[model samples]
Target: FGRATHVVVRALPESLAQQALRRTKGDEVDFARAERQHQLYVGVLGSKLGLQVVQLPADESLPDCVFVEDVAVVCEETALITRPGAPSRRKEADMMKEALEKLQLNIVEMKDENATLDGGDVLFTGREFFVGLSKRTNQRGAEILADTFKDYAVSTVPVVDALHLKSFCSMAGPNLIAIGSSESAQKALKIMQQMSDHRYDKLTVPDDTAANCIYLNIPSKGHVLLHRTPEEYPESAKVYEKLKDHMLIPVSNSELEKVDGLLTCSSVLINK
Candidate 1:
């Protein structure tokens, strides 16, 4: 569904990413090895999902900056500036906004009082709005969003576990939401379940890691593109099987497992 994906080449943080490297046999591992694996995987994701690959300027050593998808954009035509939860990420949003404007997309900036939102907690199904209130996102942010996107049915609630609400619940398909197994997550699912008689079939990812979930871009008709890591995890088999129905795409970055990232964090899709 996505015509193109924007990627920034980045290196793992030596201070924080050291633990992961230590696990794969030897004291040191080649950064190039990870980069190559990422390149091949990203290609697989694009080709499989029918997306033309586009490279953004690299930000070496900035693991968090590479998750550019979290920068603000509304649909494809308008790019809204973001107020990042992490202070380091705030400046990058402005830089990305200028880039989007260069491409002639309608641009709006969110700063000061209007800048309380984090893209990480912003979830939209195109037809409905699901807001997550967790570490980075606040209830106040949700209130602001409610006033702003008046047309959307924004549901703001608690997340008992996982990174955020999306860490457990993600848009698996335009018609489906992949949910993690948790008491709180299940309660949230009931709200959606009660709304439609559309025979919503839920696919649960194994374990509480929430690996099966990814952000979906449904550009046209029935086709869609999902961003995810292809690597096998402890419960990866069950997760992949649940996601088998959707088009899979990947981004080159290990920050996902190191922190909390997925294909969804790579870049904001510019739909035209």
Candidate 2:
């Protein structure tokens, strides 16, 4: 994340849960406490990593609110409020849309018709996009995405056991892609060869960590936010080592993983 101009708002229960985490597990060696430590950690990440955290409007019942940027579907010059795949999250996009409008940004929207489409399935790699067809985002949602981002290259990919295609593939700017091995995934990699600019490089991961990639406010040359290996993915250890030369921030979210969350799940990064 680099030079990101963020609009911060203070939204519901996010602070409550986080504060509780800090008090109870302040000294515990765990991510349960880490979730709470976020308040204190946010400042350091903002100051040191250069991420501008835009807090959202406060709401007492907003459970998945801080994933603010995740609520928005960004186009070349427009930001569309997404219809979250889950019913519980439907209101998030509207809330974010309200804040974004104040900044005078162009806004668009997608309403729920029942097929799941979580921002998690959408991977924006250049004008080319890969929509992972999974439980979170279905084939119907992929069609919506295709029509939505018609200006860009878009297609669907399967999410076999992971959360989404991004749960397996992430573009770290021009050339770097953190991905897992798959026939379809390889096909995409080969297509990257046709690009005249930077070539796509891969940090092929086992399974879990393969989907891990962090966009920082720093720079592509800056730190890439990522989670440490979860023991299951031995290859990730090597991947982490190779990335050490670059600016990399380590966020270990083991506790959150139980709730189907990871490093990328905490906060959403909005790209212009």
Candidate 3:
């Protein structure tokens, strides 16, 4: 963590993620294994990446609290507290409000009652921001976000066939985007590039899950955290190879993936 010094993370309670949440099709999660992976995740985030990890204890009431990134959008100047699209996860943001303020971050809440936004639907580059209009994020939510961050250029991307925009695209480097090849994903890439003033270089990944990666700049300790895919998916290997310019640190998030979780879904990184 070079510029990104603070990382906010929440624990995944067994009663919540493994039991209370909706069971995704083909998702056979091993509670024990998920726990071990989470331990590794927090370890790498702290020991290896050198970030100040703010660990929030498990909340039995919130099934999706472990995916804390969806609760708020953190930027350099201020933190735009989000109202989760899923009603069940609405309470997830309350705990984060105090923690963010403690870090000396200016807080801005999305107060529009009709608006529904998930932090996962937002993608902010250093210069501009892109908000995804998906099942979990509505037009009202995007409009509210645009109005809140009126100082910067904000654009909306319509999402279909995926849980969120980040489900098919993520920033891999400065002005570099790794995107999925689905029709909807391709359209998103096109719109994002145009909105960012045609400034991004695209890397189209064949495997949908492979595109859900995050690029972390830790000065000399830079690395790219991505989902570990099987050998059969050669396309995923290609995507990783392209990311070899940065140290590729693959993590097995299969259990979390079942519920539409991505590499960037677990924490809210506050860059200094």
Candidate 4:
């Protein structure tokens, strides 16, 4: 179910010059560099890997629209439209709903008014789902997540250190997780292990930021993992290099990280 045939992305806003989000209170998001890196990212996803790219136009009013993966979570044939905790991101879901509808996926939306969820807080390990109970997501949201994706096992993880669970950990390969060495990440990793009966292969790194990466098991291309550039995380790059079987592609995420954006925060991968 983790294998994707299509990807959905929203173009970054042109006015995103020297502004940053809440967590990145002082840092600036360079529009020029962010745009260039986005194109480079799309080039690898669509042009290089041959995945169908459903490019959605940038909404000038929605500054954070480019981070579309925060709105929806997709697995197999169903797409769950999430309700983000932040009021600024509330409108983002409506736009993403139309995109998922056009793809003919079974769209699942939350009915509970109190429930809030951000797709970034969810980590689908192919075999199961691990959701982070962070500021952007709550226990009720995780409850609905479990109900919507009824076929899979859903577990809610308490998050305090990072913005989301995926900010420190993500699936690296089939049944394999790539995690960081930070206290928060290590704690969350242990919680997942204790909660699930399944045993997972883990690739742990010294830098937590470097652990947030995208792993694609392309049908014909074997294994491909998109990670932060070596310049951004030098020591972590050495650890990623140990995986000789993967087509280790380095994508620059410096511009977006200023706004607390991670490697898997930009696109919604659909295994239709």
RMSD of each: 5.1, 5.8, 2.1, 1.3
Choose 2 or 3, whichever is better by lDDT: 3
lDDT of each: 0.55, 0.57, 0.80, 0.88
* Better lDDT candidate (3, 4): 4
Taking all chains together, the TM-score of candidate 1 against the true structure is 0.73
Ranking of all candidate structures by their lDDT, best first = 4, 3, 2, 1
Per lDDT, the best of the predicted structures is 4
Residue lDDT tens for model 1, 176-249? 66666667778767765665344555667654345334544545424443434446343644465444555554
Q: Tell me how many residue pairs clash in candidate 3.
A: 0
What is the descending TM-score order?
4, 3, 2, 1
How far does residue 27 in candidate 2 sit from its true spot (Å)? 19
Q: Give per-residue lDDT, candidate 4, residue 56.
A: 92
- What tens-digit string does per-residue lDDT give for candidate 4 at 44-151? 999888899999998777778888888999988899999987777788788799999999999998768899998989999988999999999999999999999999
* Pairs with backbone N, CA or C atoms under 3 Å apart (clashes), candidate 1: 69-266, 69-267, 69-268
How well does candidate 2 match the true structure in TM-score terms? 0.74
Candidate 3 deviates by what RMSD?
Answer: 2.1
